Input
Amino acid sequence: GTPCGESCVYIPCISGVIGCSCTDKVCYLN
Output
């Protein structure tokens, strides 16, 4: 729900491993 300030537009989310799921090219923390 809370954007992790990370996006998978060009490269995959690195911080996303903490739970951040890429929603519409932008990783959100549930």
